[PDB]
mmCIF file of C-alpha atoms (C1' of nucleotides) in Angstrom:
data_model
loop_
_atom_site.group_PDB
_atom_site.id
_atom_site.type_symbol
_atom_site.label_atom_id
_atom_site.label_comp_id
_atom_site.label_asym_id
_atom_site.label_seq_id
_atom_site.Cartn_x
_atom_site.Cartn_y
_atom_site.Cartn_z
ATOM 1 C CA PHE A 1 127.929 225.881 190.485
ATOM 2 C CA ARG A 2 131.268 224.489 189.351
ATOM 3 C CA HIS A 3 131.301 227.701 186.820
ATOM 4 C CA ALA A 4 131.324 231.114 188.326
ATOM 5 C CA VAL A 5 130.148 233.856 185.830
ATOM 6 C CA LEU A 6 130.030 237.750 186.407
ATOM 7 C CA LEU A 7 128.228 239.727 183.696
ATOM 8 C CA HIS A 8 129.326 243.543 183.217
ATOM 9 C CA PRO A 9 126.661 245.788 182.114
ATOM 10 C CA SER A 10 126.196 248.351 179.512
ATOM 11 C CA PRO A 11 125.251 251.920 181.198
ATOM 12 C CA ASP A 12 121.538 251.553 180.133
ATOM 13 C CA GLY A 13 121.473 247.923 181.404
ATOM 14 C CA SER A 14 120.557 246.959 177.490
ATOM 15 C CA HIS A 15 123.270 245.067 176.995
ATOM 16 C CA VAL A 16 126.753 243.207 178.706
ATOM 17 C CA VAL A 17 129.662 244.419 177.543
ATOM 18 C CA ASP A 18 132.274 242.267 179.402
ATOM 19 C CA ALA A 19 131.980 238.701 181.043
ATOM 20 C CA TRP A 20 134.125 236.743 183.311
ATOM 21 C CA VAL A 21 133.605 233.075 183.441
ATOM 22 C CA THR A 22 135.807 231.475 186.467
ATOM 23 C CA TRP A 23 136.082 228.598 188.524
ATOM 24 C CA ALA A 24 134.201 228.855 192.136
ATOM 25 C CA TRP A 25 135.595 226.003 193.659
ATOM 26 C CA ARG A 26 138.739 224.267 193.434
ATOM 27 C CA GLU A 27 137.401 220.554 195.253
ATOM 28 C CA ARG A 28 134.823 218.804 193.557
ATOM 29 C CA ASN A 29 131.909 217.075 195.533
ATOM 30 C CA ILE A 30 129.741 214.190 194.628
ATOM 31 C CA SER A 31 126.313 215.422 194.343
ATOM 32 C CA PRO A 32 123.964 212.983 196.333
ATOM 33 C CA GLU A 33 121.164 211.174 194.631
ATOM 34 C CA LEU A 34 121.103 210.996 191.060
ATOM 35 C CA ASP A 35 119.362 213.547 188.956
ATOM 36 C CA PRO A 36 115.832 212.753 188.053
ATOM 37 C CA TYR A 37 116.083 214.428 184.246
ATOM 38 C CA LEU A 38 118.933 212.728 182.908
ATOM 39 C CA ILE A 39 118.802 208.890 181.825
ATOM 40 C CA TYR A 40 121.566 207.101 183.599
ATOM 41 C CA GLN A 41 123.656 204.247 182.981
ATOM 42 C CA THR A 42 126.306 201.508 184.760
ATOM 43 C CA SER A 43 129.278 200.380 182.974
ATOM 44 C CA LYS A 44 131.823 197.847 183.891
ATOM 45 C CA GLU A 45 133.744 198.567 187.255
ATOM 46 C CA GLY A 46 130.231 199.572 188.252
ATOM 47 C CA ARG A 47 130.333 203.246 187.756
ATOM 48 C CA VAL A 48 127.164 205.186 187.142
ATOM 49 C CA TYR A 49 127.147 207.799 184.613
ATOM 50 C CA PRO A 50 124.407 209.951 182.482
ATOM 51 C CA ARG A 51 124.050 208.130 179.123
ATOM 52 C CA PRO A 52 125.844 210.991 176.840
ATOM 53 C CA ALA A 53 123.869 213.030 174.141
ATOM 54 C CA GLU A 54 124.514 211.675 170.303
ATOM 55 C CA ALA A 55 123.715 213.969 167.655
ATOM 56 C CA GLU A 56 123.090 210.864 165.013
ATOM 57 C CA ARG A 57 119.870 210.276 167.179
ATOM 58 C CA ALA A 58 118.762 214.037 166.414
ATOM 59 C CA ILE A 59 119.207 213.236 162.601
ATOM 60 C CA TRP A 60 115.569 211.625 162.932
ATOM 61 C CA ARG A 61 113.710 214.530 164.621
ATOM 62 C CA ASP A 62 112.252 213.992 167.840
ATOM 63 C CA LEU A 63 113.091 210.220 168.686
ATOM 64 C CA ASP A 64 113.685 210.801 172.548
ATOM 65 C CA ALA A 65 110.650 212.140 173.332
ATOM 66 C CA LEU A 66 109.229 208.807 172.189
ATOM 67 C CA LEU A 67 110.697 207.979 175.849
ATOM 68 C CA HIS A 68 107.275 207.948 177.093
ATOM 69 C CA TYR A 69 106.223 204.909 175.277
ATOM 70 C CA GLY A 70 108.210 202.479 176.626
ATOM 71 C CA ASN A 71 114.337 199.177 180.917
ATOM 72 C CA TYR A 72 116.085 202.019 182.219
ATOM 73 C CA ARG A 73 113.894 205.211 182.806
ATOM 74 C CA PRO A 74 114.568 208.645 184.445
ATOM 75 C CA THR A 75 112.895 209.077 188.018
ATOM 76 C CA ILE A 76 110.760 212.098 187.897
ATOM 77 C CA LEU A 77 109.352 210.613 184.518
ATOM 78 C CA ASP A 78 108.746 207.265 186.369
ATOM 79 C CA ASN A 79 107.231 209.290 189.392
ATOM 80 C CA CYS A 80 105.144 211.828 187.523
ATOM 81 C CA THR A 81 103.908 209.867 184.398
ATOM 82 C CA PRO A 82 102.661 206.953 185.547
ATOM 83 C CA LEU A 83 99.500 205.638 187.165
ATOM 84 C CA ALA A 84 100.845 204.956 191.025
ATOM 85 C CA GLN A 85 100.786 208.737 190.891
ATOM 86 C CA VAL A 86 97.491 210.491 191.621
ATOM 87 C CA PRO A 87 96.042 212.710 188.706
ATOM 88 C CA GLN A 88 93.169 211.240 186.964
ATOM 89 C CA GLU A 89 92.990 212.015 183.142
ATOM 90 C CA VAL A 90 96.093 214.562 183.028
ATOM 91 C CA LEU A 91 98.226 211.523 181.900
ATOM 92 C CA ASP A 92 96.468 211.003 178.837
ATOM 93 C CA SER A 93 97.683 214.285 177.406
ATOM 94 C CA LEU A 94 100.714 215.108 178.986
ATOM 95 C CA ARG A 95 103.911 214.906 176.287
ATOM 96 C CA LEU A 96 107.355 214.733 176.941
ATOM 97 C CA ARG A 97 110.105 217.157 175.610
ATOM 98 C CA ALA A 98 114.060 216.882 175.811
ATOM 99 C CA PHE A 99 116.894 219.339 175.560
ATOM 100 C CA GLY A 100 120.169 217.468 174.773
ATOM 101 C CA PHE A 101 123.505 218.931 174.303
ATOM 102 C CA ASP A 102 125.961 216.212 172.595
ATOM 103 C CA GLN A 103 129.554 217.716 173.456
ATOM 104 C CA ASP A 104 132.789 216.612 174.502
ATOM 105 C CA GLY A 105 133.130 216.420 178.340
ATOM 106 C CA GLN A 106 136.107 218.811 177.977
ATOM 107 C CA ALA A 107 136.138 221.961 175.619
ATOM 108 C CA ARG A 108 134.647 220.442 172.321
ATOM 109 C CA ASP A 109 130.876 220.709 171.675
ATOM 110 C CA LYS A 110 129.091 219.306 168.507
ATOM 111 C CA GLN A 111 125.284 219.577 168.403
ATOM 112 C CA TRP A 112 122.510 220.548 170.677
ATOM 113 C CA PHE A 113 118.802 219.696 169.394
ATOM 114 C CA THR A 114 115.112 220.139 171.261
ATOM 115 C CA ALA A 115 112.661 217.287 170.883
ATOM 116 C CA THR A 116 108.852 217.382 171.945
ATOM 117 C CA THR A 117 107.071 214.449 171.280
ATOM 118 C CA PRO A 118 104.813 214.331 167.929
ATOM 119 C CA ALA A 119 100.851 215.095 168.882
ATOM 120 C CA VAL A 120 100.075 212.834 165.971
ATOM 121 C CA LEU A 121 100.821 209.607 167.595
ATOM 122 C CA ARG A 122 98.708 210.010 170.388
ATOM 123 C CA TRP A 123 96.182 211.950 168.408
ATOM 124 C CA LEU A 124 95.816 209.269 165.904
ATOM 125 C CA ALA A 125 94.620 207.016 168.591
ATOM 126 C CA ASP A 126 91.892 209.049 169.420
ATOM 127 C CA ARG A 127 90.332 209.636 165.614
ATOM 128 C CA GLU A 128 88.873 206.268 165.928
ATOM 129 C CA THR A 129 87.714 206.235 169.576
ATOM 130 C CA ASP A 130 87.760 202.753 170.290
ATOM 131 C CA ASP A 131 89.365 200.267 172.966
ATOM 132 C CA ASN A 132 90.947 197.577 170.401
ATOM 133 C CA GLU A 133 92.242 199.467 167.433
ATOM 134 C CA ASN A 134 93.577 201.999 169.796
ATOM 135 C CA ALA A 135 95.357 199.972 172.324
ATOM 136 C CA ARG A 136 96.747 198.200 169.123
ATOM 137 C CA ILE A 137 98.104 201.131 167.466
ATOM 138 C CA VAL A 138 99.531 202.189 170.865
ATOM 139 C CA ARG A 139 100.934 198.599 171.107
ATOM 140 C CA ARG A 140 102.462 198.849 167.424
ATOM 141 C CA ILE A 141 103.902 202.047 167.862
ATOM 142 C CA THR A 142 105.670 201.198 171.189
ATOM 143 C CA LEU A 143 106.602 198.070 169.504
ATOM 144 C CA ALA A 144 108.160 199.871 166.898
ATOM 145 C CA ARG A 145 109.601 202.331 169.042
ATOM 146 C CA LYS A 146 111.361 199.081 171.108
ATOM 147 C CA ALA A 147 112.475 197.757 167.549
ATOM 148 C CA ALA A 148 114.189 200.504 166.376
ATOM 149 C CA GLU A 149 116.301 201.346 169.411
ATOM 150 C CA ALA A 150 117.425 197.681 170.358
ATOM 151 C CA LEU A 151 118.659 197.546 166.890
ATOM 152 C CA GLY A 152 120.246 200.938 167.059
ATOM 153 C CA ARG A 153 122.497 199.839 169.657
ATOM 154 C CA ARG A 154 122.965 196.310 167.949
ATOM 155 C CA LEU A 155 124.244 198.226 165.084
ATOM 156 C CA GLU A 156 126.396 200.506 166.912
ATOM 157 C CA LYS A 157 127.882 197.675 169.184
ATOM 158 C CA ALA A 158 127.995 195.850 165.498
ATOM 159 C CA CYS A 159 129.970 198.551 163.815
ATOM 160 C CA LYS A 160 132.068 199.445 166.622
ATOM 161 C CA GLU A 161 133.171 195.844 167.246
ATOM 162 C CA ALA A 162 133.739 195.167 163.884
ATOM 163 C CA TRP A 163 135.801 198.339 163.165
ATOM 164 C CA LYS A 164 138.268 197.138 166.229
ATOM 165 C CA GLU A 165 138.456 193.798 165.094
ATOM 166 C CA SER A 166 138.910 194.479 161.337
ATOM 167 C CA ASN A 167 142.125 196.463 161.968
ATOM 168 C CA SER A 168 143.090 194.678 165.130
ATOM 169 C CA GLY A 169 135.534 204.260 165.237
ATOM 170 C CA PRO A 170 134.336 206.140 161.976
ATOM 171 C CA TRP A 171 132.189 203.161 160.856
ATOM 172 C CA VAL A 172 129.637 203.823 163.734
ATOM 173 C CA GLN A 173 129.212 207.711 163.063
ATOM 174 C CA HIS A 174 128.084 206.936 159.190
ATOM 175 C CA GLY A 175 126.184 203.738 160.668
ATOM 176 C CA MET A 176 124.325 205.551 162.799
ATOM 177 C CA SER A 177 123.691 208.385 160.708
ATOM 178 C CA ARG A 178 122.586 206.028 157.795
ATOM 179 C CA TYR A 179 120.435 203.982 160.090
ATOM 180 C CA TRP A 180 118.139 206.619 161.803
ATOM 181 C CA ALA A 181 117.728 208.338 158.382
ATOM 182 C CA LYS A 182 116.634 205.350 156.688
ATOM 183 C CA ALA A 183 115.007 204.069 159.868
ATOM 184 C CA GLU A 184 112.492 207.155 160.236
ATOM 185 C CA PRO A 185 110.351 206.714 157.231
ATOM 186 C CA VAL A 186 109.832 203.179 158.064
ATOM 187 C CA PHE A 187 108.602 203.770 161.401
ATOM 188 C CA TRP A 188 106.220 206.186 159.976
ATOM 189 C CA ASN A 189 105.002 203.896 157.606
ATOM 190 C CA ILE A 190 104.523 201.036 160.587
ATOM 191 C CA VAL A 191 102.832 203.853 162.536
ATOM 192 C CA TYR A 192 100.267 204.383 159.607
ATOM 193 C CA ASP A 193 100.368 200.633 158.377
ATOM 194 C CA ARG A 194 101.401 202.163 155.138
ATOM 195 C CA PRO A 195 103.494 199.386 153.343
ATOM 196 C CA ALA A 196 107.196 199.514 154.123
ATOM 197 C CA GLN A 197 109.690 197.078 153.195
ATOM 198 C CA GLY A 198 110.170 194.302 155.600
ATOM 199 C CA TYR A 199 106.686 195.244 157.311
ATOM 200 C CA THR A 200 102.997 193.914 156.380
ATOM 201 C CA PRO A 201 99.968 196.110 157.433
ATOM 202 C CA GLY A 202 98.176 194.834 160.295
ATOM 203 C CA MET A 203 100.995 192.428 161.788
ATOM 204 C CA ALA A 204 101.002 192.345 165.497
ATOM 205 C CA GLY A 205 104.192 193.832 165.629
ATOM 206 C CA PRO A 206 107.253 195.512 163.707
ATOM 207 C CA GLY A 207 107.961 192.773 161.783
ATOM 208 C CA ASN A 208 111.613 192.667 161.172
ATOM 209 C CA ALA A 209 111.320 195.964 159.168
ATOM 210 C CA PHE A 210 113.711 197.791 161.372
ATOM 211 C CA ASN A 211 116.071 194.475 161.447
ATOM 212 C CA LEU A 212 116.445 195.111 157.704
ATOM 213 C CA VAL A 213 117.116 199.019 157.599
ATOM 214 C CA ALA A 214 119.868 198.307 160.156
ATOM 215 C CA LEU A 215 121.392 195.870 157.857
ATOM 216 C CA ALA A 216 121.110 198.138 154.763
ATOM 217 C CA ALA A 217 122.859 200.627 156.568
ATOM 218 C CA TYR A 218 125.618 198.738 157.846
ATOM 219 C CA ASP A 219 126.007 196.982 154.824
ATOM 220 C CA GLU A 220 125.999 200.292 153.123
ATOM 221 C CA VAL A 221 128.904 201.240 155.477
ATOM 222 C CA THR A 222 131.313 198.516 155.317
ATOM 223 C CA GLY A 223 130.371 197.648 151.806
ATOM 224 C CA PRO A 224 133.757 198.786 150.221
ATOM 225 C CA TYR A 225 135.736 196.825 152.944
ATOM 226 C CA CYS A 226 134.285 193.626 152.814
ATOM 227 C CA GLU A 227 136.962 192.760 149.720
ATOM 228 C CA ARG A 228 139.543 191.090 151.583
ATOM 229 C CA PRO A 229 138.899 187.613 152.986
ATOM 230 C CA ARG A 230 140.390 188.325 156.340
ATOM 231 C CA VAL A 231 138.083 191.448 157.011
ATOM 232 C CA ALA A 232 135.374 190.144 155.460
ATOM 233 C CA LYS A 233 135.283 187.282 157.949
ATOM 234 C CA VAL A 234 135.212 189.821 160.529
ATOM 235 C CA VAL A 235 132.334 191.862 159.117
ATOM 236 C CA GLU A 236 130.254 188.897 158.328
ATOM 237 C CA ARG A 237 130.852 187.589 161.629
ATOM 238 C CA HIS A 238 129.384 190.643 163.439
ATOM 239 C CA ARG A 239 126.734 191.653 160.719
ATOM 240 C CA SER A 240 125.067 188.396 161.691
ATOM 241 C CA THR A 241 124.245 189.717 164.923
ATOM 242 C CA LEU A 242 121.917 192.400 163.429
ATOM 243 C CA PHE A 243 119.775 188.938 162.110
ATOM 244 C CA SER A 244 118.027 188.462 165.147
ATOM 245 C "C1'" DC B 1 169.179 241.426 176.388
ATOM 246 C "C1'" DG B 2 164.859 241.312 174.451
ATOM 247 C "C1'" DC B 3 161.439 239.493 172.049
ATOM 248 C "C1'" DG B 4 159.376 235.541 169.873
ATOM 249 C "C1'" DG B 5 157.755 230.683 169.637
ATOM 250 C "C1'" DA B 6 156.458 226.501 171.205
ATOM 251 C "C1'" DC B 7 155.646 223.766 174.531
ATOM 252 C "C1'" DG B 8 153.038 222.698 178.877
ATOM 253 C "C1'" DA B 9 149.362 222.689 182.962
ATOM 254 C "C1'" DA B 10 144.635 220.086 183.154
ATOM 255 C "C1'" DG B 11 139.729 217.911 182.900
ATOM 256 C "C1'" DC B 12 139.659 213.989 181.359
ATOM 257 C "C1'" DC B 13 134.676 208.655 181.205
ATOM 258 C "C1'" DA B 14 132.682 201.307 178.643
ATOM 259 C "C1'" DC B 15 117.281 179.950 163.729
ATOM 260 C "C1'" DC B 16 114.864 182.051 158.093
ATOM 261 C "C1'" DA B 17 113.742 187.008 153.362
ATOM 262 C "C1'" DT B 18 113.164 188.468 147.378
ATOM 263 C "C1'" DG B 19 111.001 190.140 140.946
ATOM 264 C "C1'" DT B 20 112.676 193.044 135.726
ATOM 265 C "C1'" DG B 21 113.035 194.887 130.899
ATOM 266 C "C1'" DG B 22 111.271 197.861 124.614
ATOM 267 C "C1'" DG B 23 112.792 203.395 119.676
ATOM 268 C "C1'" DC B 24 114.789 203.716 114.832
ATOM 269 C "C1'" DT B 25 114.720 203.614 108.889
ATOM 270 C "C1'" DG B 26 114.745 204.462 103.281
ATOM 271 C "C1'" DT B 27 113.704 203.071 96.721
ATOM 272 C "C1'" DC B 28 112.965 202.148 91.664
ATOM 273 C "C1'" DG B 29 113.602 199.040 85.221
ATOM 274 C "C1'" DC B 30 113.513 201.581 81.270
ATOM 275 C "C1'" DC B 31 111.470 203.268 77.397
ATOM 276 C "C1'" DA B 32 108.032 204.140 74.481
ATOM 277 C "C1'" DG B 33 103.141 205.424 73.942
ATOM 278 C "C1'" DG B 34 98.764 207.825 74.802
ATOM 279 C "C1'" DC B 35 95.903 210.799 77.240
#
DNA sequence: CGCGGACGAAGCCACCATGTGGGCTGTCGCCAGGC
């Protein structure tokens, strides 16, 4: 470990009284091979780093554990969860859990959250017990998740690009907060097939349901600043990208 | 000369979607006759 701890005991051993947190190494070493658990990302210059936790995705409880219904995927999951592996039925009832600690890479810290996948999503598939309405449920759910995330990144980059341009960002924080808060019930309406705006029950896919929520959150955030024509032109150039 | 305050030292990671509404008020013609 990069950190070295020593805990001074209480005489009974019931508690710790003092603690020493200090370095064990002066020279850092590259740890060989990427960590299976984390989700990685490559960025211009080609450097590979783990995707940071975001407390905005924790606003919608348990969104990361929906990772199973899926581009880039953690290797441990991609070895043990799929069908090349070896178990027979086990894979049907496995369910994913994630521990995320969103914080600064320095000493500031913001939020942590656990996230087990809901057992309702797979159990709603077995209530029926048919090959087709079930594969269609699973297809819908996987489809819903894909739409919500693609427009989550589209909306992050939208707000981020617009904020930088408008001043020649704080818009991203409220953008994502509003996004997942509004995008959470529309997802659960798409799964149950209940009627959600931007969606028609029984449609083959998400149906633009998600693209509408992103536009409403974005327009909710950039709303007071689309007044001046110069800034309004920038904001419009970047909301247009969320039109899909 | 001593004490207190301020500053510094890092580790730092990127082609096309939108519909709604309903709750607050007062008036004569006057006089006389009959029941």
